Design a binder for these strands. Sequence first.
DNA 1: TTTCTTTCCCACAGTAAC
DNA 2: GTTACTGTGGGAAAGAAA
Lengths: 218, 424, 55
Amino acid sequence: TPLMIASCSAVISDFIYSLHNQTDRTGETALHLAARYSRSDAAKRLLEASADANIQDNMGRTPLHAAVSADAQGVFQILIRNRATDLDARMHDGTTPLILAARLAVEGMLEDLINSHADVNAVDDLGKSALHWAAAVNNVDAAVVLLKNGANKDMQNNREETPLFLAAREGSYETAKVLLDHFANRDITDHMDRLPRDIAQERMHHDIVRLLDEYNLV
Amino acid sequence: RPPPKRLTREAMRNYLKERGDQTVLILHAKVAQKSYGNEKRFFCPPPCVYLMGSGWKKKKEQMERDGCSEQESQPCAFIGIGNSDQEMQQLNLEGKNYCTAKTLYISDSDKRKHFMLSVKMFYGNSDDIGVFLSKRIKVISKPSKKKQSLKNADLCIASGTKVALFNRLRSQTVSTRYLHVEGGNFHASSQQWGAFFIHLLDDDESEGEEFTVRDGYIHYGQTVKLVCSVTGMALPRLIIRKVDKQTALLDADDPVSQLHKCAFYLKDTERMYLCLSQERIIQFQATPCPKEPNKEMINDGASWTIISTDKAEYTFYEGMGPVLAPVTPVPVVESLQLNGGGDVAMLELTGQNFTPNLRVWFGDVEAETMYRCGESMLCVVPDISAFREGWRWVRQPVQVPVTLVRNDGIIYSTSLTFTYTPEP
Amino acid sequence: HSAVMERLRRRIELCRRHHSTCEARYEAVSPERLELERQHTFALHQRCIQAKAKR
DNA sequence: TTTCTTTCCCACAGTAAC
DNA sequence: GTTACTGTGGGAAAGAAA
C-alpha cells in the first residue's frame, strides 16, 4: 500500500531502493494502478525493479489491459516495449488487449499491438476475434489493419457468427463494406441457419441489405 | 396517446425504495428429439414459464384502478419455435403463476441444428408486454446409446450444471412423471418438474452437506449428489449407473450423456436404489442379481431419464407507467469493468441486447452513456459530488447501485453496484 | 497536457458521435418495427378471444 | 469392408367418442 | 365393447463418415 500510493497518485525508488502486493477489492498490483491512473513514471520504476507485468487482478486483467482500457499511451508504450509483457494476455472472460483496442476506439494502440506481433486471430471466451469486435463497433480503420495483417475474415464465433454478420446485425455500413471489399463470405449462416442478410432484413438495416445483395459479387 | 416520458429523478427514487420488478422466466431442456414424418415427440421436460415478482400484481392493480376487467388485465402468452412457419401454442396462465408447454415439438421439416423457444406475451387488452426467448436448444436425431468420447461435449452432463429426471411407464406419454419437490420432500409429479444441481464427488467423500464438489464431466460409477435448485433439499449421495434391458450395470465407465436412461444407487446402504412406484419416491433393493457379479437387474420404476437443463430469465419495471412499446428486448449486464480512474473514470459494460436508447443510472443519477454495440456499452462515472455535497474527492466509500434505464421509462434492474473509493 | 487532453477530447467525441448515429438509426426504424409487432400481437389476441368463446 | 447417425417403420397401450 | 387415433421406444434401412 505505501509503494502503491506513490505510484498510483523519488517516492517509488526510495521505498524500493513489498512490491507484488494485490489489493483486496480489485486485486490490482502497484503496476496495475500505475497503468490505470496512467502514471508513466511510476510504471517505469516498477518495471525497472524487476516487477511482474503479468499479474492478473480480480477480473483477469493485467496492467497492459488496464493500460488500454484507461487509454494511457505512456504506460502502454512502456508495457509493449517491455519484452516480458504478454501481449495476448487474457481476462477471465477471454478478452485480450488487442480486443479492448478494437472496442474502445483508442487511437493507434491496436496497430502498435499488431506491429509488436500480437496474435490477431486470438479470441475471447465467446469466440470473437478483434475483427469481430471491430465489426460490432463499426471501427473501420481497425478492421482494415486487422485484415491487412492477416485476420481471418470468415471466422465464426461460438454462435457461428462471422464478422460480416455482426456488422449486418448492427448495421455497420462502412465496416460491412470493407469486409465485402475483401471478399468476406456473405453466405455463412449463424447457429440458427441465419444469413447476415437475414439478420439485416430483420433489424431493418436496408443499406447493409443493399450491399449484401449487390456489392462486389461473383 | 401520452408521449414517451424520460424517467425522472423522483421516479427513480421511488423505484429504488419500492422495487417491484416484473420478471418473466423460462426453464427448459438443452436438447430436443426431432420428430419425423408426421410424428410428434413432445419436448420433455415441458418448457415452463414462471412469472415471478411482486411487480406483476402491482401491475394488475394499476391496470384495474384504470378500468380493466379481470379479463383485461390477465397476462396472456404463447410459446413457439423461433422462426418456424408453424403455429404458436397458448399457455393458460389463469390464476396460475406459471405454466408448462406440454405439447411442443420440432418437425424434421426444420433443418436448424439449434433454435430457441419464443414466448410472445401481452395483457388481455392487447397491451403489449414483449417477447422473451429461451437459451438455445440443440436438435438431435435420436439419443446416442452408443459410445460417447469427451471431444463432442455439450452433450455430457458436467458437475455443476442442472438436469431434469423423468420416468416413463410402459411407453405411455400420459404416465411421464418428473422428480420434483414440495413440502420439503421428493415427489414424482407428472405435473411439474424440478431442475437439479448434479455435483460430482471423489469416491473418498464424506457424509452430508458442507461437502466439496469437484469440476469434471460425469460418467457412470462416480458418486453424485442431486440438489433442488429452488428448495435446497437434496438426495443423499448416489452413484449413477448406466442401464439397459432392466439391468443396472456396475462395471461401466462410459460418461453419462443426454437423454440416457440410468439408475441411481444409494450411499452403500446395501444395493438399494431410487425408484418411482407410480406414486411417490420410496426405497428399493432390486432383488435379481444372478446374471453376473456386475449386472444387477432392476424393477421398472427406477430407470430414470437424465436431461440437462437451462433457464432464461428477464426482469423489468414500468417506472413511468404504461409504454407504447414492449419491454422486450431486455438488457442483461454480464460484466462491469472500471476504465481508468479519478477525473476520468469510465465504465465498460458488457452483456446482451443493449440498445442505443439506454442510459445507465448510478443510484438516482443518470450518467452519460455511449452505446458501443449490442454487447458493449460505455458510460461516464458521475462526480462523487453528485452524491455528497462537499466532497471534491472521495472522503469515504459510497456505494450506489448501477441500473439500466430505457428512454421511455422502463427500468431494467441489474444487481451490480458501483462503489466510489478513495484514489490512492 | 493539452496534447494528451486533445487526444482525450477526440476519443469521447468519436464515441459520442457513434452513439448518436446508432440511436438515430434505431429510432428512425422504431415505427416500422413497432407496427409490425402489434400486427402479430393483434393476431394472437384475436385468437385468444375466440379460444375463450369456444369454451 | 467398419462405425455411426439420421430416417423409417410399426406395434404396445392409453384416450376419446360412441 | 368397438373403432379410429396417437406418443413412444425399439429395431431395421439408408446414408455418411472412416
